Design a protein around this ligand. Structure first.
Ligand SMILES: *SC[C@H](NC(=O)CC[C@H](N)C(=O)O)C(=O)NCC(=O)O
Length: 85
């Protein structure tokens, strides 16, 4: 698998998502994640929701295998229905 982190909240609560992906990339030994800056690549909150395929307005966004998940709790959920059950 491969995870991507798009942009930043800064809010500790949401940041749990990034921490989670990273920690998971210690717990599991296949899937790398990568973090990506909207400030480097130049992507809007609009773009994000466009590409994501829905009006996501919470941040961060994390994609897994090029698929938009959503925020922290989405990412927990996705790792559930895919891996943890
Ligand atoms: S301030 C951080 C907020 N995002 C998240 O925490 C990620 C998803 C969480 N499930 C949450 O939203 O509950 C955020 O982006 N807030 C924007 C704002 O409306 O405050």
């Amino acid at each position: 698998m491969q995870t991507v982190i798009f942009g930043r909240s800064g809010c500790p609560y949401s940041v749990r998502a990034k921490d989670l992906a990273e920690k998971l990339s210690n717990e599991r030994d296949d899937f790398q994640y990568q973090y990506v800056d909207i400030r480097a690549e130049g992507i809007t909150k609009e773009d994000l929701q466009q590409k994501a395929g829905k009006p996501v307005e919470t941040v961060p966004q994390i994609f897994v295998d090029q698929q938009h998940i959503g925020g922290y709790t989405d990412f927990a959920a996705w790792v559930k229905e895919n891996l943890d059950a």
